[PDB]
Each structure stands twice: as C-alpha cells, then as structure tokens.
PDB file of all heavy atoms in Angstrom:
ATOM      1  N   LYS A   1     -96.437 116.056 119.454  1.00 18.56           N
ATOM      2  CA  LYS A   1     -95.683 114.960 118.888  1.00 18.56           C
ATOM      3  C   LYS A   1     -94.793 114.272 119.885  1.00 18.56           C
ATOM      4  O   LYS A   1     -93.577 114.219 119.796  1.00 18.56           O
ATOM      5  CB  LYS A   1     -94.807 115.437 117.707  1.00 18.56           C
ATOM      6  CG  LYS A   1     -94.113 114.348 116.877  1.00 18.56           C
ATOM      7  CD  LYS A   1     -93.168 114.984 115.862  1.00 18.56           C
ATOM      8  CE  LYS A   1     -93.785 115.290 114.500  1.00 18.56           C
ATOM      9  NZ  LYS A   1     -93.955 114.036 113.755  1.00 18.56           N
ATOM     10  N   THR A   2     -95.422 113.487 120.704  1.00 22.37           N
ATOM     11  CA  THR A   2     -94.874 112.504 121.584  1.00 22.37           C
ATOM     12  C   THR A   2     -93.416 112.352 121.924  1.00 22.37           C
ATOM     13  O   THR A   2     -92.741 111.412 121.521  1.00 22.37           O
ATOM     14  CB  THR A   2     -95.595 111.214 121.302  1.00 22.37           C
ATOM     15  OG1 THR A   2     -96.821 111.416 120.585  1.00 22.37           O
ATOM     16  CG2 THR A   2     -95.966 110.610 122.634  1.00 22.37           C
ATOM     17  N   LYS A   3     -92.943 113.230 122.825  1.00 19.99           N
ATOM     18  CA  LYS A   3     -91.694 113.109 123.579  1.00 19.99           C
ATOM     19  C   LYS A   3     -91.697 114.071 124.757  1.00 19.99           C
ATOM     20  O   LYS A   3     -92.668 114.798 124.954  1.00 19.99           O
ATOM     21  CB  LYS A   3     -90.377 113.262 122.801  1.00 19.99           C
ATOM     22  CG  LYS A   3     -89.939 114.685 122.422  1.00 19.99           C
ATOM     23  CD  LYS A   3     -88.590 114.650 121.665  1.00 19.99           C
ATOM     24  CE  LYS A   3     -88.144 115.987 121.054  1.00 19.99           C
ATOM     25  NZ  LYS A   3     -87.017 115.780 120.122  1.00 19.99           N
ATOM     26  N   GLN A   4     -90.683 114.048 125.663  1.00 22.26           N
ATOM     27  CA  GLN A   4     -90.569 114.983 126.793  1.00 22.26           C
ATOM     28  C   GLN A   4     -90.712 116.423 126.382  1.00 22.26           C
ATOM     29  O   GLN A   4     -90.757 116.755 125.212  1.00 22.26           O
ATOM     30  CB  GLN A   4     -89.236 114.832 127.638  1.00 22.26           C
ATOM     31  CG  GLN A   4     -88.927 113.410 128.217  1.00 22.26           C
ATOM     32  CD  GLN A   4     -88.264 113.376 129.599  1.00 22.26           C
ATOM     33  OE1 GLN A   4     -87.198 112.848 129.891  1.00 22.26           O
ATOM     34  NE2 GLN A   4     -89.006 113.923 130.560  1.00 22.26           N
ATOM     35  N   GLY A   5     -90.750 117.377 127.305  1.00 20.88           N
ATOM     36  CA  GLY A   5     -90.769 118.782 126.925  1.00 20.88           C
ATOM     37  C   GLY A   5     -92.084 119.237 126.524  1.00 20.88           C
ATOM     38  O   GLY A   5     -92.452 120.373 126.731  1.00 20.88           O
ATOM     39  N   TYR A   6     -92.861 118.295 126.038  1.00 21.05           N
ATOM     40  CA  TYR A   6     -94.212 118.467 125.760  1.00 21.05           C
ATOM     41  C   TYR A   6     -94.876 118.115 127.011  1.00 21.05           C
ATOM     42  O   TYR A   6     -94.721 117.024 127.539  1.00 21.05           O
ATOM     43  CB  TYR A   6     -94.685 117.428 124.788  1.00 21.05           C
ATOM     44  CG  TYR A   6     -94.302 117.689 123.388  1.00 21.05           C
ATOM     45  CD1 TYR A   6     -93.720 116.696 122.609  1.00 21.05           C
ATOM     46  CD2 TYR A   6     -94.733 118.867 122.777  1.00 21.05           C
ATOM     47  CE1 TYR A   6     -93.619 116.864 121.256  1.00 21.05           C
ATOM     48  CE2 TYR A   6     -94.659 119.017 121.405  1.00 21.05           C
ATOM     49  CZ  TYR A   6     -94.120 117.996 120.678  1.00 21.05           C
ATOM     50  OH  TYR A   6     -94.036 118.117 119.325  1.00 21.05           O
ATOM     51  N   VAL A   7     -95.581 119.086 127.533  1.00 21.63           N
ATOM     52  CA  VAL A   7     -96.311 118.999 128.737  1.00 21.63           C
ATOM     53  C   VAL A   7     -97.764 119.338 128.605  1.00 21.63           C
ATOM     54  O   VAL A   7     -98.194 120.169 127.817  1.00 21.63           O
ATOM     55  CB  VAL A   7     -95.647 119.783 129.801  1.00 21.63           C
ATOM     56  CG1 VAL A   7     -96.002 119.059 131.086  1.00 21.63           C
ATOM     57  CG2 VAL A   7     -94.110 119.838 129.662  1.00 21.63           C
ATOM     58  N   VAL A   8     -98.589 118.578 129.296  1.00 20.07           N
ATOM     59  CA  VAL A   8     -99.994 118.726 129.173  1.00 20.07           C
ATOM     60  C   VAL A   8    -100.608 119.214 130.406  1.00 20.07           C
ATOM     61  O   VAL A   8    -100.301 118.797 131.511  1.00 20.07           O
ATOM     62  CB  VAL A   8    -100.635 117.428 128.747  1.00 20.07           C
ATOM     63  CG1 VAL A   8    -102.090 117.673 128.290  1.00 20.07           C
ATOM     64  CG2 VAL A   8     -99.854 116.806 127.567  1.00 20.07           C
ATOM     65  N   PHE A   9    -101.513 120.150 130.203  1.00 20.71           N
ATOM     66  CA  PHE A   9    -102.259 120.744 131.248  1.00 20.71           C
ATOM     67  C   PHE A   9    -103.664 120.859 130.924  1.00 20.71           C
ATOM     68  O   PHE A   9    -104.094 121.136 129.827  1.00 20.71           O
ATOM     69  CB  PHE A   9    -101.802 122.116 131.626  1.00 20.71           C
ATOM     70  CG  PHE A   9    -100.473 121.784 132.049  1.00 20.71           C
ATOM     71  CD1 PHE A   9     -99.421 121.844 131.139  1.00 20.71           C
ATOM     72  CD2 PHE A   9    -100.331 121.215 133.300  1.00 20.71           C
ATOM     73  CE1 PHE A   9     -98.202 121.340 131.519  1.00 20.71           C
ATOM     74  CE2 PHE A   9     -99.089 120.751 133.682  1.00 20.71           C
ATOM     75  CZ  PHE A   9     -98.021 120.806 132.797  1.00 20.71           C
ATOM     76  N   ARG A  10    -104.463 120.673 131.909  1.00 19.25           N
ATOM     77  CA  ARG A  10    -105.842 120.811 131.798  1.00 19.25           C
ATOM     78  C   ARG A  10    -106.020 121.980 132.662  1.00 19.25           C
ATOM     79  O   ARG A  10    -105.407 122.054 133.719  1.00 19.25           O
ATOM     80  CB  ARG A  10    -106.392 119.499 132.377  1.00 19.25           C
ATOM     81  CG  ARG A  10    -107.862 119.135 132.169  1.00 19.25           C
ATOM     82  CD  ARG A  10    -108.790 119.925 133.067  1.00 19.25           C
ATOM     83  NE  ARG A  10    -108.720 119.334 134.438  1.00 19.25           N
ATOM     84  CZ  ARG A  10    -109.067 120.034 135.526  1.00 19.25           C
ATOM     85  NH1 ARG A  10    -109.018 121.362 135.546  1.00 19.25           N
ATOM     86  NH2 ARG A  10    -109.459 119.430 136.638  1.00 19.25           N
ATOM     87  N   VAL A  11    -106.959 122.855 132.342  1.00 19.19           N
ATOM     88  CA  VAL A  11    -107.047 124.071 133.090  1.00 19.19           C
ATOM     89  C   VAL A  11    -108.497 124.426 133.158  1.00 19.19           C
ATOM     90  O   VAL A  11    -109.262 124.196 132.232  1.00 19.19           O
ATOM     91  CB  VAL A  11    -106.282 125.177 132.398  1.00 19.19           C
ATOM     92  CG1 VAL A  11    -106.913 125.594 131.061  1.00 19.19           C
ATOM     93  CG2 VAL A  11    -106.153 126.413 133.307  1.00 19.19           C
ATOM     94  N   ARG A  12    -108.876 125.062 134.263  1.00 20.01           N
ATOM     95  CA  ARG A  12    -110.222 125.301 134.588  1.00 20.01           C
ATOM     96  C   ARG A  12    -110.263 126.752 134.669  1.00 20.01           C
ATOM     97  O   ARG A  12    -109.431 127.298 135.379  1.00 20.01           O
ATOM     98  CB  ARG A  12    -110.385 124.763 135.980  1.00 20.01           C
ATOM     99  CG  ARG A  12    -111.747 124.936 136.570  1.00 20.01           C
ATOM    100  CD  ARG A  12    -111.697 124.478 138.003  1.00 20.01           C
ATOM    101  NE  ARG A  12    -111.297 125.659 138.803  1.00 20.01           N
ATOM    102  CZ  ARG A  12    -111.829 125.779 140.009  1.00 20.01           C
ATOM    103  NH1 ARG A  12    -112.128 124.722 140.737  1.00 20.01           N
ATOM    104  NH2 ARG A  12    -112.172 126.944 140.501  1.00 20.01           N
ATOM    105  N   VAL A  13    -111.202 127.417 134.010  1.00 18.82           N
ATOM    106  CA  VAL A  13    -111.406 128.840 134.134  1.00 18.82           C
ATOM    107  C   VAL A  13    -112.848 129.060 134.201  1.00 18.82           C
ATOM    108  O   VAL A  13    -113.622 128.484 133.455  1.00 18.82           O
ATOM    109  CB  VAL A  13    -110.900 129.684 132.995  1.00 18.82           C
ATOM    110  CG1 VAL A  13    -111.065 131.172 133.325  1.00 18.82           C
ATOM    111  CG2 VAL A  13    -109.406 129.388 132.801  1.00 18.82           C
ATOM    112  N   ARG A  14    -113.293 129.884 135.116  1.00 21.00           N
ATOM    113  CA  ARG A  14    -114.656 130.228 135.179  1.00 21.00           C
ATOM    114  C   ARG A  14    -115.098 130.809 133.875  1.00 21.00           C
ATOM    115  O   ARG A  14    -114.394 131.549 133.219  1.00 21.00           O
ATOM    116  CB  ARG A  14    -114.787 131.206 136.336  1.00 21.00           C
ATOM    117  CG  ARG A  14    -114.055 130.738 137.623  1.00 21.00           C
ATOM    118  CD  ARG A  14    -114.080 131.775 138.763  1.00 21.00           C
ATOM    119  NE  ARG A  14    -113.445 131.195 139.999  1.00 21.00           N
ATOM    120  CZ  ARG A  14    -114.026 130.236 140.736  1.00 21.00           C
ATOM    121  NH1 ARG A  14    -115.181 129.674 140.402  1.00 21.00           N
ATOM    122  NH2 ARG A  14    -113.475 129.831 141.875  1.00 21.00           N
ATOM    123  N   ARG A  15    -116.239 130.421 133.400  1.00 20.86           N
ATOM    124  CA  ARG A  15    -116.797 131.005 132.236  1.00 20.86           C
ATOM    125  C   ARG A  15    -117.570 132.233 132.596  1.00 20.86           C
ATOM    126  O   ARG A  15    -117.303 132.887 133.595  1.00 20.86           O
ATOM    127  CB  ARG A  15    -117.801 130.065 131.627  1.00 20.86           C
ATOM    128  CG  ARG A  15    -117.311 128.651 131.467  1.00 20.86           C
ATOM    129  CD  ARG A  15    -118.393 127.795 130.846  1.00 20.86           C
ATOM    130  NE  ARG A  15    -118.562 128.371 129.495  1.00 20.86           N
ATOM    131  CZ  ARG A  15    -119.718 128.396 128.844  1.00 20.86           C
ATOM    132  NH1 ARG A  15    -120.743 127.636 129.184  1.00 20.86           N
ATOM    133  NH2 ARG A  15    -119.818 129.256 127.852  1.00 20.86           N
ATOM    134  N   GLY A  16    -118.636 132.515 131.838  1.00 20.26           N
ATOM    135  CA  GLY A  16    -119.536 133.612 132.050  1.00 20.26           C
ATOM    136  C   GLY A  16    -118.927 134.769 131.402  1.00 20.26           C
ATOM    137  O   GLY A  16    -118.154 134.663 130.466  1.00 20.26           O
ATOM    138  N   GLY A  17    -119.225 135.929 131.910  1.00 16.48           N
ATOM    139  CA  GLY A  17    -118.589 137.147 131.479  1.00 16.48           C
ATOM    140  C   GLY A  17    -117.964 137.696 132.699  1.00 16.48           C
ATOM    141  O   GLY A  17    -117.269 136.974 133.404  1.00 16.48           O
ATOM    142  N   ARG A  18    -118.225 138.972 133.018  1.00 15.37           N
ATOM    143  CA  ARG A  18    -117.683 139.610 134.184  1.00 15.37           C
ATOM    144  C   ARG A  18    -118.348 140.911 134.507  1.00 15.37           C
ATOM    145  O   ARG A  18    -119.016 141.514 133.691  1.00 15.37           O
ATOM    146  CB  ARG A  18    -116.204 139.818 133.989  1.00 15.37           C
ATOM    147  CG  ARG A  18    -115.805 140.309 132.582  1.00 15.37           C
ATOM    148  CD  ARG A  18    -116.202 141.718 132.219  1.00 15.37           C
ATOM    149  NE  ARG A  18    -115.694 142.463 133.375  1.00 15.37           N
ATOM    150  CZ  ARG A  18    -115.040 143.606 133.295  1.00 15.37           C
ATOM    151  NH1 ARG A  18    -115.236 144.471 132.315  1.00 15.37           N
ATOM    152  NH2 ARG A  18    -114.146 143.893 134.232  1.00 15.37           N
ATOM    153  N   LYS A  19    -118.141 141.450 135.700  1.00 14.15           N
ATOM    154  CA  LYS A  19    -118.601 142.787 135.968  1.00 14.15           C
ATOM    155  C   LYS A  19    -117.421 143.640 135.732  1.00 14.15           C
ATOM    156  O   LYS A  19    -116.305 143.182 135.967  1.00 14.15           O
ATOM    157  CB  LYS A  19    -118.931 143.172 137.426  1.00 14.15           C
ATOM    158  CG  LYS A  19    -120.114 142.495 138.077  1.00 14.15           C
ATOM    159  CD  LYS A  19    -120.289 142.994 139.518  1.00 14.15           C
ATOM    160  CE  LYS A  19    -121.666 142.649 140.061  1.00 14.15           C
ATOM    161  NZ  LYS A  19    -121.757 142.920 141.493  1.00 14.15           N
ATOM    162  N   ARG A  20    -117.647 144.936 135.453  1.00 15.45           N
ATOM    163  CA  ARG A  20    -116.629 145.937 135.615  1.00 15.45           C
ATOM    164  C   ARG A  20    -116.464 146.114 137.063  1.00 15.45           C
ATOM    165  O   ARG A  20    -117.428 146.499 137.713  1.00 15.45           O
ATOM    166  CB  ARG A  20    -116.980 147.327 135.111  1.00 15.45           C
ATOM    167  CG  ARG A  20    -115.888 148.356 135.461  1.00 15.45           C
ATOM    168  CD  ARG A  20    -116.081 149.727 134.799  1.00 15.45           C
ATOM    169  NE  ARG A  20    -114.975 150.617 135.305  1.00 15.45           N
ATOM    170  CZ  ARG A  20    -114.510 151.725 134.713  1.00 15.45           C
ATOM    171  NH1 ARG A  20    -115.044 152.257 133.624  1.00 15.45           N
ATOM    172  NH2 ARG A  20    -113.449 152.335 135.240  1.00 15.45           N
ATOM    173  N   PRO A  21    -115.350 145.876 137.661  1.00 13.14           N
ATOM    174  CA  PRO A  21    -115.300 145.874 139.087  1.00 13.14           C
ATOM    175  C   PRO A  21    -115.281 147.295 139.414  1.00 13.14           C
ATOM    176  O   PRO A  21    -114.722 148.039 138.642  1.00 13.14           O
ATOM    177  CB  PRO A  21    -114.001 145.182 139.406  1.00 13.14           C
ATOM    178  CG  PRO A  21    -113.164 145.365 138.148  1.00 13.14           C
ATOM    179  CD  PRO A  21    -114.177 145.307 137.047  1.00 13.14           C
ATOM    180  N   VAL A  22    -115.987 147.735 140.417  1.00 10.55           N
ATOM    181  CA  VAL A  22    -115.920 149.098 140.810  1.00 10.55           C
ATOM    182  C   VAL A  22    -116.246 148.981 142.186  1.00 10.55           C
ATOM    183  O   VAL A  22    -117.110 148.173 142.503  1.00 10.55           O
ATOM    184  CB  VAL A  22    -116.983 150.010 140.277  1.00 10.55           C
ATOM    185  CG1 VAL A  22    -116.345 151.389 140.058  1.00 10.55           C
ATOM    186  CG2 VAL A  22    -117.536 149.464 138.955  1.00 10.55           C
ATOM    187  N   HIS A  23    -115.695 149.793 143.075  1.00 11.78           N
ATOM    188  CA  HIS A  23    -116.128 149.599 144.409  1.00 11.78           C
ATOM    189  C   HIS A  23    -117.539 149.958 144.503  1.00 11.78           C
ATOM    190  O   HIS A  23    -117.965 150.981 144.011  1.00 11.78           O
ATOM    191  CB  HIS A  23    -115.438 150.411 145.462  1.00 11.78           C
ATOM    192  CG  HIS A  23    -116.123 150.177 146.762  1.00 11.78           C
ATOM    193  ND1 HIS A  23    -116.426 148.912 147.204  1.00 11.78           N
ATOM    194  CD2 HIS A  23    -116.652 151.030 147.668  1.00 11.78           C
ATOM    195  CE1 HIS A  23    -117.124 149.054 148.340  1.00 11.78           C
ATOM    196  NE2 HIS A  23    -117.263 150.312 148.675  1.00 11.78           N
ATOM    197  N   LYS A  24    -118.316 149.021 145.011  1.00 10.91           N
ATOM    198  CA  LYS A  24    -119.667 149.274 145.283  1.00 10.91           C
ATOM    199  C   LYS A  24    -120.374 149.572 144.039  1.00 10.91           C
ATOM    200  O   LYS A  24    -121.399 150.218 144.028  1.00 10.91           O
ATOM    201  CB  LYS A  24    -119.872 150.348 146.362  1.00 10.91           C
ATOM    202  CG  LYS A  24    -120.634 149.792 147.593  1.00 10.91           C
ATOM    203  CD  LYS A  24    -121.194 150.865 148.557  1.00 10.91           C
ATOM    204  CE  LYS A  24    -120.281 151.340 149.707  1.00 10.91           C
ATOM    205  NZ  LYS A  24    -120.140 150.322 150.777  1.00 10.91           N
ATOM    206  N   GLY A  25    -119.822 149.123 142.928  1.00  8.84           N
ATOM    207  CA  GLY A  25    -120.418 149.352 141.672  1.00  8.84           C
ATOM    208  C   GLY A  25    -120.870 150.732 141.480  1.00  8.84           C
ATOM    209  O   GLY A  25    -122.041 150.914 141.222  1.00  8.84           O
ATOM    210  N   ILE A  26    -120.014 151.727 141.601  1.00  7.75           N
ATOM    211  CA  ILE A  26    -120.471 153.076 141.317  1.00  7.75           C
ATOM    212  C   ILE A  26    -119.523 153.703 140.390  1.00  7.75           C
ATOM    213  O   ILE A  26    -118.379 153.953 140.702  1.00  7.75           O
ATOM    214  CB  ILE A  26    -120.637 154.083 142.456  1.00  7.75           C
ATOM    215  CG1 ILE A  26    -120.778 155.574 141.962  1.00  7.75           C
ATOM    216  CG2 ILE A  26    -119.507 153.903 143.490  1.00  7.75           C
ATOM    217  CD1 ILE A  26    -120.854 156.623 143.058  1.00  7.75           C
ATOM    218  N   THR A  27    -120.059 154.301 139.365  1.00  4.14           N
ATOM    219  CA  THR A  27    -119.199 154.973 138.480  1.00  4.14           C
ATOM    220  C   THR A  27    -119.705 156.321 138.628  1.00  4.14           C
ATOM    221  O   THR A  27    -120.869 156.552 138.941  1.00  4.14           O
ATOM    222  CB  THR A  27    -119.315 154.541 137.090  1.00  4.14           C
ATOM    223  OG1 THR A  27    -119.272 153.134 137.109  1.00  4.14           O
ATOM    224  CG2 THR A  27    -118.119 155.054 136.297  1.00  4.14           C
ATOM    225  N   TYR A  28    -118.816 157.280 138.477  1.00  3.29           N
ATOM    226  CA  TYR A  28    -119.183 158.655 138.522  1.00  3.29           C
ATOM    227  C   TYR A  28    -119.529 158.898 137.126  1.00  3.29           C
ATOM    228  O   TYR A  28    -120.651 158.664 136.708  1.00  3.29           O
ATOM    229  CB  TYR A  28    -118.055 159.560 139.055  1.00  3.29           C
ATOM    230  CG  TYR A  28    -117.371 158.781 140.120  1.00  3.29           C
ATOM    231  CD1 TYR A  28    -116.006 158.522 139.972  1.00  3.29           C
ATOM    232  CD2 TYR A  28    -118.084 158.147 141.164  1.00  3.29           C
ATOM    233  CE1 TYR A  28    -115.357 157.608 140.815  1.00  3.29           C
ATOM    234  CE2 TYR A  28    -117.425 157.237 142.011  1.00  3.29           C
ATOM    235  CZ  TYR A  28    -116.064 156.958 141.829  1.00  3.29           C
ATOM    236  OH  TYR A  28    -115.386 156.015 142.635  1.00  3.29           O
ATOM    237  N   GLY A  29    -118.527 159.258 136.355  1.00  4.08           N
ATOM    238  CA  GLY A  29    -118.539 159.246 134.929  1.00  4.08           C
ATOM    239  C   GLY A  29    -119.696 159.801 134.177  1.00  4.08           C
ATOM    240  O   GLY A  29    -120.839 160.015 134.578  1.00  4.08           O
ATOM    241  N   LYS A  30    -119.421 159.933 132.901  1.00  6.06           N
ATOM    242  CA  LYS A  30    -120.429 160.268 131.973  1.00  6.06           C
ATOM    243  C   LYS A  30    -120.972 158.925 131.651  1.00  6.06           C
ATOM    244  O   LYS A  30    -120.583 157.942 132.255  1.00  6.06           O
ATOM    245  CB  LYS A  30    -119.804 161.103 130.830  1.00  6.06           C
ATOM    246  CG  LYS A  30    -119.111 162.420 131.308  1.00  6.06           C
ATOM    247  CD  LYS A  30    -120.010 163.530 131.925  1.00  6.06           C
ATOM    248  CE  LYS A  30    -119.218 164.785 132.386  1.00  6.06           C
ATOM    249  NZ  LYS A  30    -120.080 165.949 132.748  1.00  6.06           N
TER     250      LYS A  30
END
C-alpha cells in the first residue's frame, strides 16, 4: 500500500533441488 518503508526486491534463487553435500559424496552410514 503505496508509501515509504515499503521496499521492493526482486530476488533470484537457483531452482532445482540439491545434493546432500558430502565430501566426495560418500556416506558411511546405514
């Protein structure tokens, strides 16, 4: 509703999903 304090941002975020980051992609685990 049109006055100061109201600030607009456009924002860019990569889509997709993600990997579980693991070094070298190795899990010990069960």
